[PDB]
């Protein structure tokens, strides 16, 4: 249907690459003698000139940019991030893909008010993967994410680096953060506020830029796809502009939780909100050609319900040079890793129905606001469970996300006989797309940390109104590991604290080296991640 947003100069602006975020300090952990990397991120308003001949757009971002800066963290290095609210509305930061403790996970009620900060303590122990950090504040997640609060967080491993995949952040390893928004006649954003169905957007962005281009050499690139959109799901394919409907082969090498067992040879990649897939595309057969990254129409080929607009079939263009300036020393091995699948279970699956209760998006008829009814499962730590995730309806779709865990996709059924499990769903995931009339069974090890955690649809409009619930990963009273201060996301020890902007700017008072060192060393003495030690 007709584009609503003003006409944009398609494929004229280079793909931006978010800068790498550097830590301010390293603090010695008195428990293990190891360095903890400490970072400061300032959430603040800013403007950006999106449309060259109109006015600017009003954004609110991590470090006053969108996307937020990219984290690059080696496995085995703990991190503390001080997220400072210098904005207009509350925030709650979630590191999506991290088995963080409950009070460091972005629980939707665990908010930071403007004029406060919160210290988040992250483990960085899981398999190498593409994580992302984003806002999660109750009922305002869609607008906070839409206006800029999302960024990438790469967890690295020298063992994965030994596979010799295309490498170098911004060189041959390229972030591909997808969003879908709508602009006013004078080039500002159309707010998501008021939307209760879905906010599709008619302008496709990569790394915050509408319909960009990038100059590439005729060789292999690693692309890290993230769907950070409010409500748009995608069916991605590549085509030569000389044959714009002919899909070009590529390889999927990783899903939400890390590498697949083997690369999946693919010409069409379904990707829904909060999913990450890493692709290697080989431009060597396309020297001197322009390759367009495109998006399926027909509501993602009948899997979705999304509205399609005049230019939502287009993502970006790659302009391929005639030769390389350096040899392509990269490869995609046929064997990537032994995926650490959970033990199979015989426990009858738990059922969760994603639908509506009057106008509200619900789980088993419950809204997250309903404190009394929203705790839908008690799961003893160490248990494996199958969850049967049911979309009975034809009128919407739901990418379901479970915090804490990685899971195996066991099965997909479709009431439209449309598809089953996709080859790139063969590994470990933390989001799974329930297309029209789809039921998916997932299998997860509820481990290794006890606490109250969220699960929800990741369509941010559904999520806010109000399709989210909780589970409790439970332990007995003789379980140790300081569990009594780590199970409750609202535990007073880990709450947000007020700050004065002068002290932040001067790096004085509670931002002094001495004050930060004492705070982080005190936090480290509680040993939040010890139950994951190997
Ligand atoms: C989620 O699960 C955790 C358990 O993994 C629940 O925490 C446990 O709650 C019980 C009952 O409140 C606590 O036992 C109580 O201890 C107090 C203090 O000694 C005592 O006065 C009571 O008679 C009772 O024995 C237990 O200590 C606590 N465990 C931990 C590790 O903190 C938690 O309540 C569940 N959360 C929700 C929201 O249901
Ligand atoms: C659970 O969390 C508590 C509280 O953070 C941990 O207890 C703390 O353990 C630290 C060691 O990191 C104790 O510090 C000690 O200070 C004394 C001097 O006062 C010094 O001689 C020792 O060498 C050490 O530095 C700290 O006092 C202690 N605090 C309390 C209130 O007990 C505890 O280890 C954690 N337990 C687990 C199972 O994680
Ligand atoms: Cu998320
Ligand atoms: Cu998450
Ligand atoms: Cu949904
Ligand atoms: Cu969540
Ligand atoms: K140090
Ligand atoms: Na595979």
Author numbering: 1 to 534
From the primary publication:
MvBOx, composed of 534 amino acid residues, consists of three cupredoxin-like domains with four copper ions forming two active sites.
Trp396 was mutated to alanine (MvBOxW396A) in order to enable direct solvent access to His398, to phenylalanine (MvBOxW396F) in order to introduce an aromatic residue not capable of crosslink formation, and to aspartic acid (MvBOxW396D) in order to disrupt this site by introducing negative charge. It still interacts with the main chain nitrogen atoms of Asn394 and Gly395 but now through two of its cyanide moieties. Ferricyanide in the W396A mutant interacts with T1Cu-coordinating His398 through a water molecule, possibly mediating electron transfer. And even if Trp396 forms a part of the ferricyanide binding site in the wild type, it is not necessary for its binding. Although the adduct is probably involved in electron transfer in MvBOxWT, its presence is not crucial in the case of ferrocyanide oxidation as electron transfer can be realized using another path, possibly via the protein main chain of the loop forming OS1 (residues 394–398) or via water molecule in the case of W396A:FECN. The W396A mutant binds bilirubin with a lower affinity when compared to the wild type.
